[PDB]
Every structure is written in C-alpha cells, then in structure tokens.
Design a protein around this ligand. Structure first.
Ligand SMILES: COc1ccc(-c2ccccc2)cc1N1CC(=O)NS1(=O)=O
Ligand SMILES: [Cl-]
Ligand SMILES: [Cl-]
Ligand SMILES: [Cl-]
Ligand code: NA
Length: 294
C-alpha cells in the first residue's frame, strides 16, 4: 500500500507536524452564521468550534452543534457533535431520534484534566431514567457490558409524544485522552469493529452519532479510520486509499477534524493494520482482542 510507503517517508524525515499543518492550511472554510448567533452562545461548548451552516444538523430554535459528514464515495454518513451541555441533552437525544441513529459513539470521559468536558447525558442506573421535558423524550439504561477500556450500553429511548420506543447502543471508549491517541492500533480497531458488528453503521439506520468533547479530534480520528477502511473494502485495494485526501474531504463538512499530528499518524497505523482484516486475514481480529486486554 502507498499509505505504508508514505508513512515510512514521513517517519524518516520526521515531518508529521508539517504534513498535519499543510492539511489545516488547505482545510475548507465555510460560514457558521447560525452557530454564532447570540441566542446560540449557550448551545456551544467551545467558542471556536462550530458546525458549518451547509452541513449542520437541524432539530425539527433548530440549532445544535452537530454536522453531517456525508461521505459520498464511501457511502457512509456520520454525525459529529460536541459532548452535550447541561441545557442541550434534550437536543442531543432529539437529534438521535430525528436522525434515526442506532448507535452513539462516545470517545471521551465526562471529566478530563479536572474539567467537565461532557454532561452526564445518559442514565447510570436502570431505576433512574432520565426525562427530557423540553424535547419530550425518556431515556432508560437497560443493560451495560463493561470492559477494561470501553463500555457498551443498551439504552431505550422513548418518544413520549407517540410512545414509540427505540434501542440505542452506546459505545464508550474510556481511555482515549483528550489531544491524545488510543493505547495501540489493536485497542482502537477492537473498539471500531465492536461498533461495526452491532449493525449501527448499516445504511438501513440513520447516521451513527460520534462525539468526544468538541466533536472534532478523537471523533475525527475515529471517522477517518472507519471511512478509509470502508473505501479500501469496497475496492478491495488498500493502495488506492489516500488518507490526507479523505481527511480533507471530511473537513468540508466539519472543521478541525483530527486535532494533532500524532492523531493523524495514529490514523495511518490503524488503517494499515485494519487493512489486514479487510483483505482476508481472519486471525487478526482475535489478535486485536487479545492485545487490547479487554
Ligand atoms: C478536551 O478536548 C478538546 C478541547 C478543546 C478543543 C478545541 C477547542 C477550541 C478550538 C480547537 C479545539 C478540542 C478538544 N478535543 C481534543 C481531542 O482529541 N478531541 S476533542 O475534539 O474533544
Ligand atoms: Cl465518563
Ligand atoms: Cl481528572
Ligand atoms: Cl458539561
Ligand atoms: Na448542501
């Protein structure tokens, strides 16, 4: 694969920083007029992380800090959003409901570096459901499966207006530090494939909702890897994937995707290693499971 040749050349010349900064300089710039309106100040976690108008998710005030990353060639969509705020947990679950998502991928912890980077937007106990009065939704913890570095939750979301009920799967990576990277390619891919195996990325469901704290760094890394693997999967041709071009394509839909050079570097590693599975190595998934120490 060309990505592996290019990774070798970037490593040898120690130029991940320059390569990553070139991507930032070339990244699309689009207006975020709605996000910046005064009435939406308290709906944004970070003043400088906004959804572009053209790709933003509208609630059915229609504003949420969330973007539809619509990957035409790969035929997969993701919604990337910030970690919900205390006043936007209702909006968040409303979006899940309206967009018909089946999975939420959370790549952060509620507390990071002493600070609250995400609201407690799901119930931690079966007998303590959450009711969101503004959006008329009820959220119940049904079960959870806790592993050493991630947790999967079965949630029940009820639209109280219609009394319809849906099952939402919550995939919570708990050891991915802000501005950092997963422990190994194996941990990351073990997690990614857990999401894939649930059905949550199927085109029969709405786009998976992915978030971290700002919904760009770790959320970006996750989606870049998944898309690159899907592209080579559809063509069965690892060598045809250009990672930097795919990342630039994603950045047309939301700003700042992948926040450090090392996250970009890690994405190459994950994609090169995931390629083994795509192209028919049937022992590698169990290797990843074992190496992840779940
Ligand atoms: C704690 O995580 C973050 C905090 C602030 C910003 C940020 C804020 C303003 C401008 C650019 C980035 C970005 C992050 N992220 C780092 C990260 O790795 N993922 S993230 O999008 O949650
Ligand atoms: Cl947490
Ligand atoms: Cl802490
Ligand atoms: Cl918060
Ligand atoms: Na458009």
């Amino acid at each position: 694969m060309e990505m592996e040749k290019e990774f070798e050349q970037i490593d040898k010349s120690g130029s991940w920083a320059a390569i990553y900064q070139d991507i930032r300089h070339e990244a699309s710039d689009f207006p975020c007029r709605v996000a910046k309106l005064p009435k939406n100040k308290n709906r944004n976690r970070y003043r400088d992380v906004s959804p572009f108008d053209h790709s933003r998710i509208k609630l059915h005030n229609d504003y949420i800090n969330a973007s539809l990353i619509k990957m035409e060639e790969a035929q997969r969509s993701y919604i990337l959003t910030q970690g919900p705020l205390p006043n936007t947990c209702g909006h968040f679950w409303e979006m899940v409901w309206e967009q018909k998502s089946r999975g939420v991928v959370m790549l952060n912890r509620v507390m990071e570096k002493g600070s609250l980077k995400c609201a407690q937007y799901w119930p931690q106990k079966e007998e303590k459901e959450m009711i969101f009065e503004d959006t008329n939704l009820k959220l119940t913890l049904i079960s959870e499966d806790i592993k050493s570095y991630y947790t999967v939750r079965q949630l029940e979301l009820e639209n109280l207006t219609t009394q319809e009920t849906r099952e939402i799967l919550h995939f919570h990576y708990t050891t991915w530090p802000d501005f950092g990277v997963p422990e190994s390619p194996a941990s990351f891919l073990n997690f990614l494939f857990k999401v894939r195996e649930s059905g949550s990325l199927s085109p029969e469901h709405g786009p998976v909702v992915v978030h971290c704290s700002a919904g760009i760094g770790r959320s970006g890394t996750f989606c870049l890897a998944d898309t690159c693997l899907l592209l080579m999967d559809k063509r069965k041709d690892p060598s045809s994937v250009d990672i930097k071009k795919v990342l630039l394509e994603m950045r047309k839909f939301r700003m700042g995707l992948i926040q450090t050079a090392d996250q970009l570097r890690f994405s190459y590693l994950a994609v090169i290693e995931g390629a083994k599975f795509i192209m028919g190595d049937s022992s590698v998934q169990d290797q990843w499971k074992e190496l992840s120490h779940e």
